[PDB]
Amino acid sequence: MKELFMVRADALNEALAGYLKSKNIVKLPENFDIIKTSHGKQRAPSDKDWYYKRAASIFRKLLIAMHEEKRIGVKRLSRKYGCAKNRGSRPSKHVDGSRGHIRKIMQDLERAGLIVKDGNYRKVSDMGIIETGQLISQI
Amino acid sequence: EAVRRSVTVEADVFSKIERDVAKASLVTAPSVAEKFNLNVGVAQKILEHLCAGGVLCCLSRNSRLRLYSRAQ
């Protein structure tokens, strides 16, 4: 997927996140407005639509892992969404992301048919390939 | 010395700083916050508002600093 990269990365993200919100294919949890998103974070995310903006970021990470011909799970994906925890007087150690909402945000990407599992790894499917193709045609 | 710069606009500084930024060549958001007693947070959105009007053209859009100069 060479044409994935030939548009701007963050400009892809709200175009992707606004797609997942408009098509209603990712569903909000009950406590979405108060999730720390890691145990290293100090506040909840300030953005009201942070949940979609992450769903665009996760689906982009599965897109590039398919471009690298590599399989990615939820636990390895949380490491990409971890920050460095202010541990008080101790040195600030890197901690992992919150796995719980990442698992549900990928299950909604299975319901839309974007992400189809291959063995024990979920992979991007042809439906995810096509629907990105109209998006990056428009960016 | 404790300073807490006013987070308000009193309808007399806004035309005062609009006359002031029309005077100067280049102004930045912390500079009006020191020359006047404004928070630089409200001073940031004023100069974006004077960029929305035909008062000053946007120079550099960076998160560290947003620079503004007079139009034409």
Binding site: - | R5, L26, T28, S31, L59, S60, R64, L65, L67
Partner: protein
């Protein structure tokens, strides 16, 4: 080739014959960052560009150690405010800051015997440039620490006030403070 894609290094006139050897104005990169091994050859501080010598003076006081990308981004901003406040080439206003802040004569203690006498000492051109960099990077940092001034403004504040000699700039009121101690002992 132009600095920051905007400013030409070629049309920068260092008027001082003393510092013309050491202020490096040969266009080698659009950015200040050239990771060259010029410190090893014992005089190559006059071979890395003056803006790279300047941004290395910024990244100071421990917490900013080595943050050159932060400094030259905060100089990329600092040259736009300078150029649109003055019209001059911001490299030309930078070299005019350092020739107006390097102390030409200094006070030091010299004695071959056990008794040492404080005497006036002439300053080398490369030392004159080294401590011109040091005095303005102190005044930039100390004026932007616990105030509403940013790093990108305090560069623009000091280097403008250093280029037109005035007691506001921290460099020349420390340069003249140094040279007064030379006349204090001679």
């Amino acid at each position: 080739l132009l600095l920051f894609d905007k400013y030409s290094r070629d049309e920068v006139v260092v008027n001082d014959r003393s510092l013309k050897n050491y202020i490096f104005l040969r266009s080698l990169s659009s950015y200040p960052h050239t990771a060259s091994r010029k410190g090893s050859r014992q005089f190559g501080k006059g071979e890395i560009p003056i803006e790279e010598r300047f941004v290395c003076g910024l990244m100071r006081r421990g917490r900013n150690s080595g943050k050159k990308r932060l400094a030259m981004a905060a100089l990329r901003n600092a040259f736009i405010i300078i150029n649109t406040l003055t019209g001059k080439n911001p490299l030309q206003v930078l070299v005019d800051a350092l020739v107006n802040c390097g102390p030409r004569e200094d006070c030091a203690r010299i004695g071959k015997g056990g008794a040492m006498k404080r005497t006036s000492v002439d300053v080398s051109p490369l030392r004159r440039l080294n401590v011109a960099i040091f005095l303005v990077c102190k005044g930039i940092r100390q004026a932007c620490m616990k105030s509403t001034k940013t790093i990108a403004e305090a560069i623009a504040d000091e280097l403008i006030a250093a280029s037109r000699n005035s007691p506001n700039s921290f460099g020349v009121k420390k340069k003249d403070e140094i040279e007064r101690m030379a006349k204090s002992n001679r």
